[PDB]
């Protein structure tokens, strides 16, 4: 069936799969079709190949992905705010985006768009 | 026209015409064919009036709306995490919304989701 238990669960490991570095785990919640729109407006990363992928172009440093705050889910759809910090050559940043998660009828993700925007990124100098 | 910087306005604006109850506020920030979806799973409702009495009903309880995050917007789309705190029968009660908006090319809300399930809902008793 499927449960905002559930996609507060999917939700749960799929920022787990990520602050492992685990990128079969990121690939597990979705389904073999979903698209990704990283951020959110360019061209979607379709099927599990551009998917993988991305979340492989992204893993390339430990990603320090935390929930900022509570998720909320219904009908479907799962929204959730967040962190992602990661250093390279001396300096700090964090991107602070909201993904909303749109589950199909079976269980799984089916959609994933994450927003953020050059506010929403805070590196140091 | 737009711009990221734009909505931040209209985010902002919107959680001061809800603690304020400035109901032309609220609505003049909206498409005058724009529709709300509060919560996701209700069916929607459409034209400026049929807005404006739905906002009508959310102000009768005073509303201690608060943003708990940086709102973030990219591609004429603006997502935030919040919390409408009111109280009735002496009871403190709080939502903790997660809401999606989407704008078009005028900068007006053409679109209005609110995210939040019942783990969502911080009342005691």
């Known amino acids: ?5 559930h996609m507060t669960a999917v939700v749960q490991r799929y ?19 979903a698209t990704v ?3 959110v407006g360019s061209e979607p990363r379709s099927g599990t190949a551009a998917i993988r992928e991305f979340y492989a172009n992204s893993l390339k440093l430990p990603l320090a992905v935390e929930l900022t705050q509570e998720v909320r889910a219904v009908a479907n759809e ?11 050559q001396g300096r700090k940043t964090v991107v602070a985006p909201i993904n909303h998660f749109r589950f199909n ?4 993700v ?11 990124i805070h590196a140091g100098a």
Chains 1, 2 share one sequence.
């Open 78 to 88: 799962a929204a959730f705010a967040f962190t992602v910090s990661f250093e390279y």
């Open 1 to 5: 069936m499927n449960t905002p238990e």
């Open 37 to 39: 729109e990283d951020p």
């Open 105 to 108: 009828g079976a269980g799984k």
């Open 15 to 33: 920022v787990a799969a990520l602050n492992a570095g685990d990128l079969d785990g990121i690939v597990a919640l979705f389904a073999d079709d």
């Open 110 to 120: 089916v959609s994933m768009r994450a927003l953020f925007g050059e506010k929403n």
